[PDB]
């Protein structure tokens, strides 16, 4: 039964390789049985013996002596040694991994209304995942008298079974997993909320640990069955348990993108905005004034604020004063937990500032306030990003006016050295470097001019007088807040594309003097394809090396476990700062 014959649609049966090698060995060995009685000459006797040897060497490891046997097709037959080794052998395909029950798969979508410990599950999948529990509860209440009756009742779905499904999953966790599964955070546990449709809804804050985005990703789901498994899922694998990395000491939940942009816009400051100069009784007055329409978020005002601090043993002691601030900062102050200073929001809040806020709240107050603070921050960011109407247009990308000078003068200098090549004065292998340096300097000048114009593009009339302030250009704010876009990408969008490289690795002498706003011509676009193809090819072929290295590292250390408390030894390692060249690369604090 471990080497069976499988029937087919027609009369013929599919056959296994082993039953062919076995029959070959049997016939070749039995041919010698009759020859013994006949007493054939030794000339025939010897040759058959060898024919037996190779036949056995067929049932055992094949291909180890050359000229591997084949069958009807042009492929070698697989022997017993082929059933134990390799990626398709028993060890790596049926014992260290396998296929399981009570599982499912679907596409994932974002759910912006969820709490950090919840996920959205389709009801069509759920009704089939939790079948035996529904059967048992149906038997409990007397709605059926047999397994077949319960199965038919579930199949011909009625309204009574949906309340049963609602009560079965009330406090039952599920596990979600994304396929590549690089660290242990690739599997987590959640509480399911029944929804309509066919896709799975996922919390925005767990995406970065999963490396997931909503452009076609899929996910798998599994259901624990025993009390021990449910308790392990609740106590060890729940998403509220995992907020700190195992590889280092950094938080793994962190807002990004629209949340960051909304909080950044909410906490900016302007000059001579509407409502400037008022004195307020507190954050509620600011909220009332802003929602009425009598004041702007960016107005500079005075508000009365009260804050709590650790007194001497974790007791909150209060202090009240007047503070110069803006309307938006006072409005945002209403979600900060009790115990943190007011100075932590009295500024423009970028990505790093928000991460620092979260870490400070985790250190001072603990775990339970931290998750509530994170969820409130996400709600506020999503709410206030929509109200701004932030957009992108073609006139957002501003091109400096002096660019047409900087390039032109550069084209003069490169010409001059060419004259020095007419009459022998410089080495023919030297003008290359000088031209490259000229082009690098010109690119630096153009980039500096572009950034200098873009960062202060706003000029403002305070009161009968002019002044400069940080601008509100969409691209600039998106780059400054840390939501999306590095400086080099802005360079490519509105500055200069720069110098490319040949496929070998040399530097092409003439740069691309166009950007992506004023488009490229045929030659520059053709030049820029080598780098793209090289990057894509490098990405496509070096995943296997990383996977192999990871498997080797896992194999060498899979058995190391903490087994005691103190061994008693006295040796160790001396720690010293890493200083090379003159700049201290690593201090003497984080290492110890």
């Amino acid at each position: 039964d471990l080497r069976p014959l499988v029937p087919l649609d027609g009369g013929r049966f599919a056959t296994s390789d082993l039953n062919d090698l076995y029959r070959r060995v049997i016939n070749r060995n039995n041919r010698l049985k009759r020859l013994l009685d006949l007493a054939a000459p030794d000339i025939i006797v010897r040759n058959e013996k060898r024919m037996l040897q190779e036949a056995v060497d067929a049932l055992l490891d094949n291909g180890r002596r050359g000229r591997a046997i084949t069958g009807s097709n042009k492929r070698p037959l697989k022997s017993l040694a082929d059933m134990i080794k390799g990626k398709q052998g028993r060890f790596r395909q049926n014992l260290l991994g396998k296929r399981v029950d009570y599982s499912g798969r679907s596409v994932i979508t974002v759910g912006p209304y969820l709490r950090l410990h919840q996920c959205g599950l389709p009801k069509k999948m759920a009704l089939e995942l939790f079948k035996p529990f529904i059967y048992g509860k149906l038997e409990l209440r007397g709605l059926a008298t047999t397994i077949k009756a319960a199965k038919k009742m579930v199949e011909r779905e009625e309204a009574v079974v949906w309340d049963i499904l609602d009560e079965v999953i009330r406090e039952h966790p599920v596990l979600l997993n994304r396929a590549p599964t690089l660290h242990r955070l690739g599997i987590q546990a959640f509480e399911p909320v029944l929804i309509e449709g066919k896709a799975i809804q996922l919390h925005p804050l767990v995406c970065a640990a999963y490396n997931a985005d909503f452009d076609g990703d899929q996910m798998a789901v599994h259901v624990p069955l025993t009390l021990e498994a449910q308790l392990e899922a609740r106590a060890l694998m729940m998403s509220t348990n995992n907020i700190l990395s195992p590889a280092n000491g950094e938080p793994i939940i962190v807002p990004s993108q629209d949340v960051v942009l909304g909080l950044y816009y909410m906490t900016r400051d302007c000059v001579n905005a509407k409502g400037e100069g008022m004195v307020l009784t507190g954050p509620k007055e600011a909220e009332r004034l802003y929602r009425s329409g009598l004041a702007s978020l960016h107005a500079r005002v005075k508000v009365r604020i009260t804050e709590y601090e650790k007194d001497a043993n974790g007791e909150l002691v209060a202090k009240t004063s007047l503070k110069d601030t803006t309307v938006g900062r006072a409005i945002l102050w209403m979600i900060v937990p009790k115990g943190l200073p007011y100075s932590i929001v009295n500024q423009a809040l970028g990505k790093k500032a928000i991460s620092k806020m979260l870490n400070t709240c985790y250190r001072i107050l603990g775990l339970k306030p931290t998750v509530i603070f994170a969820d409130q921050i996400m709600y506020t960011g999503f709410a206030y990003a929509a109200r701004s109407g932030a957009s992108v247009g073609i006139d957002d990308m501003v091109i400096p006016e002096k660019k047409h000078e900087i390039i032109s003068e550069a084209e003069a200098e490169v010409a001059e050295i060419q004259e020095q090549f007419q009459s022998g004065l410089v080495t023919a292998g030297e003008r290359y470097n000088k031209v490259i340096d000229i082009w690098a300097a010109a690119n630096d000048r153009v980039s500096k001019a572009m950034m200098d114009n873009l960062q202060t593009e706003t000029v403002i009339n305070r009161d009968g007088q002019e002044e400069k302030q940080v601008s509100f250009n969409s691209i600039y704010m998106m780059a400054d807040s840390g939501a999306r876009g590095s400086a080099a990408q802005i360079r490519q969008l509105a500055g200069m594309r720069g110098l490319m490289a040949k496929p070998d690795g040399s530097i092409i002498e003439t740069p691309i003097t166009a950007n992506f706003r004023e488009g490229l011509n045929v030659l520059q676009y053709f030049i820029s394809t080598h780098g793209a193809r090289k990057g894509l090819a490098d990405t496509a072929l070096k995943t296997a090396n990383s996977g192999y290295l990871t498997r080797r590292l896992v194999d060498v250390a899979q058995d190391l476990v903490v087994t005691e408390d103190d061994c008693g030894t006295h040796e160790g390692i001396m720690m010293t700062p890493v200083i090379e060249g003159g700049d201290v690369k690593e201090p003497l604090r984080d290492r110890v």
Binding site: K542, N545, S546, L549, R552, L553
Partner: peptide, 15 residues
């Protein structure tokens, strides 16, 4: 440099 460097160290490769 890069991944080959670390794969060469962790395999105790002879220079």
């Amino acid at each position: 440099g890069g991944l080959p460097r670390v794969a060469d160290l962790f395999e105790a490769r002879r220079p």
